[PDB]
Amino acid sequence: ATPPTLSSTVLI
Amino acid sequence: VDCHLSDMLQQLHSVNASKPSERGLVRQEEAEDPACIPIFWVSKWVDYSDKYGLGYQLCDNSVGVLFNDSTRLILYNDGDSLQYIERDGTESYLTVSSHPNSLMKKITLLKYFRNYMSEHLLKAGANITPREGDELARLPYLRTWFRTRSAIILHLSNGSVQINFFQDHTKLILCPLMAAVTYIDEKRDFRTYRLSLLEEYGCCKELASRLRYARTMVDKLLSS
């Protein structure tokens, strides 16, 4: 799986 | 819902010209309006622009993708109903259960984007409750978007403009039909203000700064 360029706030 | 950007630009010009953070006593709380809360906004998004495009989730749990070829595929919150928008803007309504073989590739991509967002990302404004008839409203799609060193700008088909600031996670949702602005602050507090009332009562330097930035962003959307 290739990670995206950018994304919104990730879960914690 | 086309000529809405120019209305938003005029509304922003009006509020910014009034210098709202420069009042004798700013009474921002008096500019609040709960009746102006937006029905739709982008709760999650993923940038895969190098090869596929931008995936996003709306607050109603519907997912969409704006592909690199400038086409859009939207999956309704039921997980079967689909909406496909061509570059010209022509809409087509289909289902996953009975989909044309022509969309197999784009549907597969949307399902990957949907699964990524579900597994990895936090839902913005998750605490907000929907009103009595909001579910019948026309589901908007992402018209256009762009990134800056400070924010992501999202322009919806219903005329609304969303600005998500990277550094402090603050967000603006501008609705031109209601001439209102929703601000989600650092403490994740969700407040909606009438723009004509921010002119009347003023606001904090924080919000006033975001509104000046918003005017620059709307100008960029209109020039594009």
CA angle B160, B166, B172 (to 5 degrees): 25
Q: Are residues B62 and B15 in the same domain?
A: no
Q: Are residues B48 and B106 in the same domain?
A: yes
Of A4, A5, A9, the CB nearest to B122: A9
Cβ proximity of B158 and B138 under 8 Å: yes
Q: Of B139, B154, B170, which marks where a domain is finished? A: B139
Q: Are residues B2 and B53 in the same domain?
A: no
List of chain A residues whose C-beta atoms are within 8 Å of the C-beta of residue B50: 5
Q: Where are the alpha helices (H) located in chain B, listed in sequence order?
A: 4-17, 104-120, 195-201, 205-223
Q: Are residues B15 and B5 in the same domain?
A: yes
Of B42, B46, B50, the CB nearest to A7: B46
Say which residues have a Cβ less than 8 Å from residue B219's Cβ, sequence separation at least 6.
B9
Q: Are residues B70 and B16 in the same domain?
A: no
Closest Cα of chain A to B140: distance in Å?
20
Tell me how many residue pairs between chain A and chain B have CB atoms under 8 A apart. Answer: 36
Alpha-carbon span B197 to B186, nearest angstrom: 23
| B120 touching A (Cβ < 8 Å) | yes
Strands B53-58 and B42-48, by their bridges, are antiparallel
Q: Are residues B197 and B218 in the same domain?
A: yes
Please give the tally of structural domains in chain B. 2
**Residues across chain B:** 224
Q: Backbone breaks in chain A (C–N > 2.5 Å) follow which residues?
A: none
Alpha-carbon span B156 to B153, nearest angstrom: 10
One-letter amino acid of B196: S
Solved with: X-ray
Q: Are residues B158 and B121 in the same domain?
A: no
Output the domain CATH number for residue B161: 3.30.1120.30
Of B44, B48, B49, the CB nearest to A8: B44
Structure tokens at B219: 């100008």
Give the domain extent around B115.
43-139
